Amino acid sequence: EYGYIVTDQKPLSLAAGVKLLEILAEHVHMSSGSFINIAVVGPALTFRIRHNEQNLSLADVTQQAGLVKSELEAQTGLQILQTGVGQ
Amino acid sequence: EYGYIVTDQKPLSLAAGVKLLEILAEHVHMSSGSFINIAVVGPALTFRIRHNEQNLSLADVTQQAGLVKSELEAQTGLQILQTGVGQ
């Protein structure tokens, strides 16, 4: 499984994808360095999460990305079209 | 916002789509009639959720869909490739 965020960017830059992860990390109180297997592919950011004490899951992180969607958009200048988990 | 389930069937049939919703409903102990605004679009099923006695959310229902993906697949023959929330 991997997490993803689909944006309106064609294509999404690597820098912007990492900024999304920085904001998300701050909200889930973890190091942005706990996001692994990162790539941007077309308009999408994909990632996994490293083992952690907190037991934070991909589910948890994508739910969180919905909770703070407005903040993610405001701080990055992009639009988030989908957030989910792929197989 | 809407919830979605992306399959490996293009076009996804409406009947197959709502069969996914029935299995999902059984799993989360909600009536499938609480899934509203339903459409199939390409390989995807999209929906929203009405007031329900269980007070359940889109992130929660789509996370659960991810959890029971092998059941959804065993019962329908579809593969579930993504689950998430869109705008």
Ligand SMILES: [Ca+2]
């Ligand atoms: Ca928006």
